[PDB]
Every structure is written in C-alpha cells, then in structure tokens.
C-alpha cells in the first residue's frame, strides 16, 4: 500500500504539498517544508521586484476557513531562482516555483530566466493566472483573451513544460471556455484548481467590523467554505483536459478531503488554510489518514481511484 | 421592542422571509409560510408552463450547507398569479412573486400579466437573473449585455417597481459592471444578493459517488459554505446602489447571521437552506435571537446599524 506517484518526470513520495503562499516565503519556510513529510513544495508566488504587500491585518482564520488580501508580499524573483538553482536539495523532494507577475511582460521576463534552471535542475513552473492585471479589468483567468495572451507569451518565452494555477469558476460555459483555452497550449502539463474564492467578506458580530484591513475587508476565501467548489473545478478540468494533469487545492483538512479530491481527479493535493493553521505536522496526519481510508477500501495505489468518482444512474 | 419596517410602500412585521424555491412551490407551502412568523414570503420561481424539474435525488443537505439542481420544478405561472390574485391574505404579510422565464420573451409575457395584479393587490415582482438563457452560454447575470436586455424589456413590459435576484460575483470589476447595469433601471428598486454559489460538487467518501443525480452531481451551494460570499455581495451592491434596497440571502442560520447581513446593508433577510432543514419555526427563533443581539448592543431599530459595518483604518 503506497502513496507514491511519478509524473512530470519526477517521483513523489506522496501527493501532498503546501499551496502557494503558505509556508513558502522565506528560506526558513522553504527549509521547513523541505524537512516535512510533504511529497513536494511550491515557493511563494513572486514578482520581479520584492514586495512588502498590503497593510496588516491581511489574513485571518476561523473554524470554517480563512480570508486574505496579502497583496503578493515576496522576496522577489531573484531570491526564488536562487533557492531553486543553488539552495534546494532535490534529493529530498521536487520543487515547484510559482510566479505571479502583474503584467504579461513581467511574467515573460521571469520565465526566460527560469528556463535554464528548470532544464538543468528540474524545478517545475506554476504560473499564477488568478492574479490582477489592469485595475477595473477582471483578474487574468476571468478575462479569457488576457489568459490566452499570457499562455501564448509564456509558452514562447519558456519553451518547457509548466502548470497553471486557476481561480474557481461557477458556470459551465466558463468551464467550457477556460479548458478550451488551456487545451490550446501543449506545454501546459498541469492545472491547479483552485485559487481562493474571490472577494468574500467576513464580519465579526461583536465588534461590528470586517477582519482584514485592505479592500474594505474584501478578500479571498479558503478552507472548509470552498471544498465543494474546489471539487467541482478539479473534476470539471479533469473531464475536459484529458491530456493534462489536475492538481487539487481547496478545503483539504483531512485524508478524507484529499481522498475526495483524488476521486474527482487530483494528482497532487495542495494544502493552504489547514497548513497555515496546523503547521507542517499536518502532512504526516494526512498521509496516515488517506492510507487508512485506502486500506478499509482495499485500494493499494492512488491510480486505482483517481478520477473514479461515480455519478448517479 | 418590535422589528417592524416599511419599504416598497409595504409594511413588514420583521425583516425575515423564505428564499425563493424553499417552502414555496405548492398552495400548501405558501399557506404554511403565510401562517409562519415570517415578515414576508416569496413564491417559487416560475415559468409560463408547469415543470417537473430534474431527476431525483436533486437536493441534499449536510452540516455545512446544501447542494441542489432542482431544475425549476414549479406549478407554472398561472398558478402563482392566481395565488397572488385570489388566495393570498395580504392582511397577513406581503407577497413577492418570483419569475424565472427561460427566455426574455417568456419573462415579458409573464410580467405583462402580473402588472395589473401588482397594481390591484400589491404583490411584488422578484425577477430571477440567476437563470440560464441559452445552453452553451453563461447564465443571464454573468452576461451583462443579456442582463441589460432583460431589464430593458421587462421594465418596458411591467412598468412598476420590481427587484432582481442576483448570482454571487467574485471580482470587483464585475461588481462595478453589474451595479452600473442595474443603476440604469430606475424601476429596479431592490436587489437580492445572492442566489446559490453555482456548480459546486459534493462527493460522499463512503460510496465514492456524487450526491445529486443531475448534471453529474454539479449544483448550486447554499448554507454555511456561502455566508462570507453573500455578505460581500450584499455590501458591494449596497455601496454601489445608494438608490435601491439590498435584500440579503445566503447562509442565514441564526439571528447573529441575520445581524451580519443587515450590518452589510440588507433590508430584508431571506432564509433558504436553514429553512429547508429546520422548517418554518425557524422564523420565531431568528426574531428572538436578532432582538437579543440588538438588546445587548443597545440598538432600538434596524436603521441604526443597517449598512454600518466598520472597516479598519
Ligand atoms: C495567506 C495566503 C496566501 C496565499 N498566497 C498565494 C499566492 O501567492 N499564490 C497563489 O497562487 N495562491 C495563493 N494562495 C491561495 C492558496 O494557494 C489556495 O489556492 C487557497 O487558499 C485555497 O486552498 P485552501 O482552501 O487549502 O486554503 C494563498 C492563500 C492564503 C490563505
Ligand atoms: C432547494 C432549492 C430551491 C431553490 N430554488 C430557487 C428558485 O426557484 N429561485 C431562486 O431565485 N433561488 C432559488 N434557490 C436559491 C435560494 O433562494 C438561495 O439564494 C440560496 O439557497 C442561498 O441561500 P441559503 O444559503 O440560505 O440556502 C433555491 C435554493 C434551494 C436550496
Ligand atoms: C485577484 O486575486 C487576489 O490575489 C491577489 C491579489 C492582489 C491584490 C493586490 C496586489 C497583488 C495581488 C496579487 C494576488 C495574487 C496573489 C494571491 C494572494 C495574495 O498575495 O494576496 N492571495 C491568494 O489567496 N491568492 C493569490 O493568488
Ligand atoms: C442558474 O443555475 C441555478 O439555477 C437554475 C438552474 C437550472 C438548471 C436547469 C434548468 C433550470 C434551472 C433553473 C435555475 C433557476 C432556478 C434555481 C434553482 C433550481 O430550480 O434549480 N436552484 C437554485 O439554487 N437557484 C435557482 O435560481
């Protein structure tokens, strides 16, 4: 009985990894995720220049999840490139590097310089499409013409297999359109579903106040609020993108939640809010939990049930 | 202390009502909501002809909420009109009628016939914009040119004050666009935020199966999953539509949840999932709990705190 996977020409002890933005910003964080029993890690989404991000408080969590408007704080691309090229021990586990440029030009600039390190060291690019572009325009992946533009330029500029991080969608015609766009690009070998549920608003009854400072309290939602939405996106893309891998992300607190993601079609399973809250010991719990479920059901490997969610008659 | 209010030229004992679709489809349902402690009721969204709806199972509920793909089962427009015209006791509470035609032409033919009963009896129109139009393309409220057409044609055909039931949005540019469309229509006097969170997927770990039969298990989410999304939509529209009222719908299980919707800006508060699960006794509990939070805070009226959610710095 085993959780091992091999994909994108890499071998993974198990399917768990942090979600981008959680426990991945500093060298300390990245060493910690490397020391964990995660099967991989992803570095904090970066921009060309380092960023302080938004004023605090900018993340808060609660029993059913989290809200954030961090504002892409990060050490800058040069830092994460260096971590990939000189500091990361790939004998431990593979490394994804998330990039989240604020324009298509910024992303092109970073991927041209990532390419030789990716070729040589085997670092895997996760391009964040759930990302602002022009203010007053929708985020990139809710603007299908900008999304096409971004994947065209990055495919050209990078020339290597990469993956994309997607916002949730809530309409079947949007699933149909978004997957068609992704399927235009052979180099997009994996699709991570999902980024947070956009522009939620948490209000504290006692103080009569929003809980985060930026954007009048509006921010992205993660955690238990978003699991069914995350499962639907994973399955929607799994069913529409047969030639690509789908990584699952949203509401994983338990091996049973990871189990559902994998039945929906997930290959890797990312952990954001639950990992922020519980810390990296979560990965041993999740592995034990999923293995216990597999044993009860008589499944010996992930491929025996990946994508095998049943529908009704 | 009593929670009485007046709006749209009608008097309400309190700000609670059922959400459209819940406990509102048959004459029995409607009479049951009328006998409840609710401030108002809305009928099931209707089409010109009666509809059986989608295959069962089509609704399921769980600790954190519900998923449904009911498929607009209803007794048809002639039935709801006759309930509004001959059967409802307006001395008991106001009545809203929800219209959800599958084309713009369907909605115009229904509102033309509704207008004289509205004039004569005071029944209030809630137009459902979270409704498909054409297969292959997005639901109406996610296609702003089609939304504008529906509002233009309906305002012309109906010619009296009405309201709109909106899907959640998740992107600020989309709030800006949707609210500017609605503000083009002086007759749209209320906006109900929000309809269910579209196309989630619930999977049962034991059976490895989705839980509703239609659409391969995909359906709208309500309940606790959706409260911060509903609060964000209530507030976003409240800030953008100073000349309209905003009705809150989504994730109300408690008087505290109703408190948060009103702080966000809600005038009326609709109850779907919680009502489906608890039954119409819920309205007494909600009233008592809201009154209790008001007492503890020293609020004497809803108006003292409606829309008064505090931001940080
Ligand atoms: C504090 C915080 C920071 C995040 N930063 C990023 C980021 O930089 N890039 C990114 O793609 N997603 C980011 N996310 C999104 C998560 O990676 C994830 O998609 C979302 O939280 C849903 O997963 P969850 O339900 O496990 O939290 C962030 C989430 C949180 C809570
Ligand atoms: C079983 C079911 C049937 C529904 N039918 C309708 C409908 O006919 N029209 C409508 O505008 N919304 C309909 N809804 C949406 C609710 O009115 C409401 O917007 C949604 O459930 C979110 O509220 P809640 O969190 O309190 O459930 C329905 C919801 C449920 C659960
Ligand atoms: C459009 O989705 C929100 O994500 C962002 C919001 C930003 C707001 C101001 C400046 C930069 C922003 C960057 C992002 C993308 C980074 C990101 C963040 C974040 O850094 O705020 N939080 C998430 O939940 N997901 C993300 O993908
Ligand atoms: C736009 O998707 C949610 O609403 C509907 C979905 C339907 C699917 C197939 C056929 C008709 C549909 C009609 C609607 C509108 C009625 C409705 C329903 C419903 O009757 O399925 N459920 C909701 O949660 N909200 C609604 O507004």
UniProtKB/Swiss-Prot annotation, chains A, B:
Substrate binds at residues 44, 68-72, 128, 133, 195-196. Binds 1 FMN per subunit. It is an enzyme of class 1 (oxidoreductase). Changing residue 1 to T: In allele DHOD3. Pfam families: DHO_dh. Its cofactor is FMN. Optimum temperature is 37 degrees Celsius. Its main location: cytoplasm. GO terms for molecular function: dihydroorotate dehydrogenase (fumarate) activity. It is found in: Cytoplasm. The keyword Flavoprotein applies. Changing residue 97 to V: In allele DHOD3. GO terms for cellular component: cytoplasm. The active site is at residue 131. InterPro entries: Aldolase_TIM, DHO_dehydrogenase, DHOD_1A, Dihydroorotate_DH_1_2, Dihydroorotate_DH_cat. Keywords: Cytoplasm, Flavoprotein, FMN, Oxidoreductase, Pyrimidine biosynthesis. Its EC number is 1.3.98.1. Pathway: Pyrimidine metabolism; UMP biosynthesis via de novo pathway. It comes from the Eukaryota. One of its GO terms (biological process) is 'de novo' pyrimidine nucleobase biosynthetic process. It catalyses: (S)-dihydroorotate + fumarate = orotate + succinate. Catalyzes the conversion of dihydroorotate to orotate with fumarate as the electron acceptor. Molecular oxygen can replace fumarate in vitro. Belongs to the dihydroorotate dehydrogenase family. Type 1 subfamily. Homodimer. This is Dihydroorotate dehydrogenase (fumarate). It comes from Trypanosoma cruzi (strain CL Brener). The gene is pyr4.
């Amino acid at each position: 009985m085993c959780l091992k996977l091999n994909l994108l020409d890499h071998v993974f002890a198990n399917p768990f990894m942090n979600a981008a933005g959680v426990l991945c910003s500093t060298e300390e964080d990245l060493r910690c995720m490397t020391a964990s029993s995660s099967g991989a890690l992803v570095s904090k989404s970066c921009t060309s220049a380092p960023r302080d991000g938004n004023p605090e408080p900018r993340y808060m969590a609660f029993p059913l999840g989290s809200i954030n408007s961090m504002g892409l704080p990060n050490l800058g691309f040069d830092f994460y490139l260096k971590y990939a090229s000189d500091l990361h021990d790939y004998s431990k586990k593979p490394l994804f590097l998330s990039i989240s440029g604020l324009s298509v030009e910024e992303n092109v600039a970073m991927v041209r310089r990532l390419a030789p390190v990716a070729q040589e060291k085997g670092v895997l690019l996760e391009l964040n499409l759930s990302c602002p572009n022009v203010p007053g325009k929708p985020q990139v992946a809710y603007d299908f013409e900008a999304m096409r533009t971004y994947l065209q330029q990055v495919s050209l500029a990078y020339g290597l297999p990469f993956g994309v991080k997607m916002p949730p969608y809530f309409d079947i015609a949007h699933f149909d359109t978004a997957a068609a766009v992704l399927n235009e690009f052979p180099l997009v070998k994996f699709v991570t579903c999902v980024n947070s549920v956009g522009n939620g608003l948490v209000i504290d009854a006692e103080s009569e106040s929003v809980v985060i400072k930026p954007k009048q309290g509006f921010g992205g939602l993660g955690g238990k609020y978003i699991l069914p939405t995350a499962l639907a996106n994973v399955n929607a893309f799994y069913r529409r993108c047969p030639d690509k891998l789908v990584f699952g992300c949203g509401g994983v607190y338990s091996g049973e939640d990871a189990f559902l993601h994998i039945l929906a079609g997930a290959s890797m399973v990312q952990v954001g809010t639950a990992l922020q809250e519980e810390g990296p010991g979560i990965f041993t719990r999740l592995e034990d939990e999923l293995l216990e479920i597999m044993a009860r059901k008589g499944y010996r490997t992930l491929e025996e049930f990946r994508g095998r969610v049943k529908t009704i008659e």
